[PDB]
Design a protein around this ligand. Structure first.
Ligand SMILES: [Mg+2]
Ligand SMILES: [Mg+2]
Ligand SMILES: [Zn+2]
Length: 462
RNA sequence: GGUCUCUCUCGU
RNA sequence: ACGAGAGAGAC
């Protein structure tokens, strides 16, 4: 992905989009009870913690483009993945505007607690002024569909969240692209059933983990991924995608039965325009993270990538013996023989991709179930039933969360949720955690789930 | 101050 | 089942 041009909003005639510059995060009552290295992300260019120009660090993720059209490796990869998807019998027909706005059994409704994007977000219009959960009225949408039309600019916001200290010094906050409600509606109408299928079928057929529940899913992964394990994360995945991968996505869609009308929407996310404050810019390549389908398209493009890198890097790769699951740029995968991720990474570099260990270790080592991670969690067989597998979020991560809050009004929910994560790390670790929480006045007011019940309710999921 | 997923809580 | 809130995860 590469920025093409930047023009002042006076010149494009786009409404400014300013977002907040102060974090919602404050230290919590547990801040000094637990150790932690994270702080809120840099939101403002005059942040005393900065050690670089802010805006330049922000947009450095657009590292440029390499390929624009598929080579023979990516064509074969695209096609193999497309065949895999066919057995799913994805309904390529258009989803109704009613189901697209207000949801289905396998697709949540448009988030009405979230911005409506450009232009509404400068016109002081909320999603709730246009949609209504109770009516399921769809006509105020169509009025606006015709008023403002489609392909409306994304609004660039910095993301308010905890980050490691290193990324704060380097001003490397995360950018998200607020989609106009129109485009979200039209994409959900175009790919809602695909969304439904993917959500209902996490695993190695979709090649996706979207819609998985780590508590039950994790016991299946060793069965879905037999053989030698390998794993990846990427650095700046979204912005590092060159247009070739959106082309490859197109072929996949067309192969599984999408009309040329449908397929044509992909170029609309490969070539995007963004408003950031008082400027307009053009990004060619890159996933506009914040468009509808982000997680899923990220994951599909990821399936094409892995396949393409395998058959271009190694001799006599049989793609039918690949098993992989992806969540965005997260990858857990298996193959009948050990895969040298260092060489895959080298080949990924040629295409503009920066591939790293899945734990952001400094080098690629052997991956196995004892050291594998997926969605930050690691894999721990239960000491009584070894075929049941605990998803283990590292306590360190759980400590980072509990030290901050955006509203102390939800301390009890915050702490309980963490508890539901922490207990997988086992009895001794859990009581260590609970103990610390109780060592402070507010902690003694908190309803903390009992370890025994947690484990009992987990077992019964099976 | 986005797309989404999972889970929990509180109501009817 | 429907609403409201939250936490976590991927970009
Ligand atoms: Mg990454
Ligand atoms: Mg990742
Ligand atoms: Zn452009």
């Amino acid at each position: 992905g590469e920025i093409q041009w930047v023009k002042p909003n006076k010149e494009t005639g786009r409404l400014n989009i300013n977002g907040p510059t102060r974090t919602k995060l404050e230290p919590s009552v547990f801040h000094d009870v637990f150790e932690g290295n994270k702080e809120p992300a840099v939101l403002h260019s005059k942040d005393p913690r900065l050690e670089v120009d802010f805006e330049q660090a922000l947009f450095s993720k657009y590292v440029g483009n390499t390929l624009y059209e598929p080579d023979e490796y990516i064509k074969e990869a695209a096609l193999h993945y497309a065949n895999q998807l066919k057995q799913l019998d994805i309904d390529t027909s258009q989803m109704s505007m009613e189901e697209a706005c207000y949801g289905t059994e396998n697709l949540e409704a448009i988030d009405l607690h979230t911005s409506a994007g450009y232009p509404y977000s400068a016109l002081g219009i909320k999603k709730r002024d246009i949609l209504d959960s109770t009516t399921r009225d769809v006509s105020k949408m169509k009025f606006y569909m015709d008023k403002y039309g489609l392909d409306l600019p994304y609004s660039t916001y910095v993301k308010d969240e905890l980050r490691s200290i290193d990324k704060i010094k380097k001003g490397k906050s995360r950018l998200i692209e607020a989609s106009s409600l129109n485009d979200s509606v039209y994409l959900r109408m175009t790919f809602g059933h695909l969304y439904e299928t993917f959500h209902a079928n996490p695993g190695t057929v979709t090649g996706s983990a979207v819609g998985c529940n780590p508590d039950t899913f994790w016991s299946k992964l060793p069965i879905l991924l037999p053989g030698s394990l390998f794993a990846f994360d990427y650095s700046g995945y979204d912005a590092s995608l060159s247009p070739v991968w959106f082309r490859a996505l197109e072929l996949v869609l067309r192969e599984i039965g999408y009309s040329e009308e449908a397929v044509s929407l992909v170029e609309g996310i490969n070539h995007t325009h963004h408003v950031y404050r008082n400027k307009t810019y053009c990004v060619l390549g890159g996933m506009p993270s914040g468009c509808s389908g982000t997680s899923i398209f990220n994951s599909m493009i990821n399936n094409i990538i892995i396949r393409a890198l395998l058959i271009k890097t190694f001799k006599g790769i049989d793609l039918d013996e690949l098993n992989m699951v992806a969540y965005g740029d997260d990858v857990l995968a298996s193959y009948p023989f050990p895969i040298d991720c260092l060489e895959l990474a080298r080949t990924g570099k040629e295409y503009g991709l920066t591939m790293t260990p899945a734990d952001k270790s400094p080098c690629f080592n052997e991956v196995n179930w004892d050291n594998a991670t997926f969605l930050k969690r690691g894999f721990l067989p239960d000491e009584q039933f070894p075929f049941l597998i605990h998803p283990t979020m590292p306590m360190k991560e759980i400590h980072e969360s509990i030290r901050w809050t955006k509203d102390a009004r939800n301390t009890q929910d915050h702490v309980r949720s963490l508890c539901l994560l922490a207990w997988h790390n086992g009895k001794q670790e859990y009581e260590k955690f609970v103990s610390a929480i109780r060592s402070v006045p507010v902690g003694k007011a908190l309803a903390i789930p009992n370890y025994e019940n947690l484990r009992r309710n987990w077992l019964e999921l099976f």
